[model samples]
Target: MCVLTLVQDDVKSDILKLVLDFIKAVVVKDDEKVAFPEVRHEKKISFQYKDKQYKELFCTLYAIIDIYDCYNELFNEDEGKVSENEEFIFHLASDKFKLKQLDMKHLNDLLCEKSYIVSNRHASIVDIFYFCSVYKPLSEMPAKERVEISHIYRWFLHIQETLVGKFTTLKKLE
Candidate 1:
């Protein structure tokens, strides 16, 4: 129900900003506001959004993306979004795929081959989630685990590069 308005400085952290950017790619309607985190110093993280779909995806994204404490503020061990983890479908190559687990093994296989799980050419919301989840944690992985997930790290770099161009054009057009 809230309409978010943000400048680049409004986001409290890099990872949250990255998530909002990918959310833009999906649900940010032209001339409408987009999502951004509320500023509250070091309190629990909260986000404001202009679109319901933006909020839905943000809340439900935890199901497939592997970020520890990504939605940490919402769970009542202090709680809140989609309320629980559940399967959801996203499109790929004109088909639908069910995503239900935080450790997405099939998705890892896909990232091993392609730059992104949703498309070869563009970064989707899923890519954003993957990027945010791994942005910090990838480096924290044990050396042995790092080798096993090397492709994920590589894809992270690709998405980072691709988003630079994606947001560049988005800026010019908007």
Candidate 2:
């Protein structure tokens, strides 16, 4: 039993270190280093917290990163026009973030699912902005929508703040 406990502690320590390093890479805008190869990358990654529902919230976050990369690729295209590709990119992003495409119902569903893992306050705000940006017709989307797509935007300051706080807390434990 003691040996098992020690092994478990070691595993947790490793996970925490990886999480912290990934967060630091993100903070420093080092995309190459941010990819966490050590994390389980299977279709349905799972983790449990004190017998509650196990949720792989980090996978959703990784999907978000992938969608962002796709968005940037489209945005930088020669045409510089929002097309079906961009729409598809948004769909992918929404899916990765647990949101349904262009539907408030799905958005709310995502919020509920994420609330199981994330704080309701943070999850709610993230959902609101994400829903607003992706639900509208791309041609008619306001400037705010384009700007809001960036996770680093001012409106999303809370996400960075929360990320930093979580990363710092985990790092201090090491």
Candidate 3:
């Protein structure tokens, strides 16, 4: 038997910081609405949380709220089309993050199956993956059918709650 010390509050704080860094990479933006490439692409991509579920869940949430929501906002009589710059941003975003083909496909499938009401626009494979490819970063999306980031946040929180519960208490382990 081994003894371990786990400070619950401190663990939560570190997870919060990890979530912030993950968001920073996903948005590639600071408060000024600038997509700082250096910061976004400054270093090779890494997650403080190694679990694939953590990255997969948050990235999907970002797509629904930020990517699809923004695309829906600019859609009018013309078929919804994003700019070349936007496409470039999407490419860079995907390239920098480093995703696995199978996991990417898997995540995409999960998002599509959920049937997110994206501004009344249909969400296909693109909606789930390669979002940055067609999304305008730093643009504010009007809250139509999209849920706020907090909604996704609570999902993460729920996941963490379930996870910490799994660890054997030091008392129990002994």
Instruction: Please report the candidate that would top TM-score against the real structure.
Output: 1
How many residue pairs in model 3 have overlapping backbones? 2
Predictions ranked by lDDT, top down? 1, 2, 3
Full-model lDDT for every candidate? 0.42, 0.34, 0.30
| Per-residue C-alpha lDDT of model 3 across residues 106-142, encoded as one tens digit per residue | 4334444443212223322233223322122202334
Q: How does residue 61 of candidate 1 score in lDDT?
A: 40
lDDT of 2 by residue, 39-95 (tens): 333344343223333334334333433433432322324334335334544454455
How well is each residue in 1-174 modelled by candidate 1, as lDDT tens digits? Answer: 433222332222333455544544433435364333443333333334334323323352452133223333222122121222111122321232223334545566777776655445455445654554444445456766655766775676666654533322122211
Check candidate 2 and list the clashing pairs: none
Who wins the lDDT comparison? 1
Return the TM-score for each candidate structure: 0.43, 0.23, 0.18
Over 4 Å off in model 1, which ranges?
1-16, 20-105, 142-144, 164-174
Q: What ranking of all candidate models by TM-score puts the best one first?
A: 1, 2, 3
Give the distance in Å from residue 32's predicted Cα in candidate 3 to where it truly belongs: 35
Error of 3 at 134 (Å): 12
* Candidate 1: clashing pairs of residues: 74-80, 75-79, 76-79
